[PDB]
Design a protein around this ligand. Structure first.
Ligand code: HEC
Ligand code: HEC
Ligand SMILES: [Zn+2]
Ligand SMILES: [Zn+2]
Lengths: 136, 136
């Protein structure tokens, strides 16, 4: 019933990135530069295959600094983690949702079984609750 | 004496990212969101090792659209490529420098055998001509 810390996620496939700056509706709490990562099982789902149990997607969120017409990555703020288990995470559409403050395994963030996470992700039912699209 | 197109670079290790906005000294031609990738051999150099022959670093540059204070990745503009071969690329400090327009193997951008690239990268002699640092 708990999402595993995704050890070694930084070596996985980089799906995409986006910057959320002040003024964006989502500045609280996903303000910053984020990078999405996918393990091999998640790549199968992202390609248009189905997501096997053990698929993991990571939302890696950094603070940034303005440095002379550059946004430079600062400290990690958190990671979001989606872990596929159709049975064990059936209450949240077959994905377990967890956050780790500063990406630390000991700073688990989710208190409601991931219902809040699932609430936003539910809009994406038709793409198996995943916003991110594989790009070249 | 030509740099090979780095086929499969998008499945490599994501080292780091940075946004270069309009007004930056380098806006022509590296304005946009860039992602740095390293093959296995390049990781050895980034971790504190000697860069072995066969090390490849890729600078993957995307256009972006500012959309309600989100910076959203658009089309790939180009990739920059550094390929380690101490003998073959001896004239430019053991790295071969090349650009591919839109990341296409047919669109070679370097016209001076990489002397201009080398000219900037030479400032980083003490880190084997590599600007990017491995981060967690
Ligand atoms: C809407 C108000 C959101 C809430 C609440 C949560 N997330 Fe989210 N998430 C959202 C968007 C619009 C995106 C796509 C970002 C992009 O660059 O395209 C995401 C992405 C993720 C990812 C990457 C996988 C994907 O679906 O694209 C993960 C792993 C993720 N989110 C986890 C997550 C968790 C654990 C949440 C509860 C703490 C959570 N999200 C809330 C929008 C929203
Ligand atoms: C200074 C005026 C530059 C010139 C001319 C070129 N590059 Fe560059 N490059 C520069 C900086 C400051 C950085 C680091 C970017 C970051 O996010 O920190 C880079 C990076 C690269 C990379 C990634 C590897 C690394 O050294 O960090 C590659 C593969 C790369 N650059 C290639 C490249 C080529 C092929 C050039 C000539 C066409 C070239 N660069 C010119 C600064 C400068
Ligand atoms: Zn200025
Ligand atoms: Zn703005």
């Amino acid at each position: 019933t708990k999402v595993k810390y995704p050890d070694g996620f930084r070596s996985w496939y980089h799906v995409k990135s986006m910057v959320i700056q002040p003024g964006h509706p989502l500045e609280n709490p996903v303000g910053g530069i984020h990078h999405v990562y996918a393990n091999a099982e998640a790549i199968q789902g992202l390609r248009g295959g189905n997501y096997p149990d053990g698929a993991v997607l990571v939302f890696d969120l950094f603070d940034y600094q303005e440095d002379n017409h550059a946004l430079v990555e600062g400290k990690r703020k958190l990671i979001g983690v989606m872990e596929r288990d159709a049975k064990r995470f059936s209450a949240t559409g077959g994905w377990g949702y967890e956050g780790f403050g500063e990406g630390k395994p000991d700073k688990r963030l989710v208190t409601d079984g991931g219902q809040g996470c699932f609430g936003c992700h539910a809009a994406q039912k038709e793409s198996q609750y995943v916003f991110s699209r594989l790009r070249d």
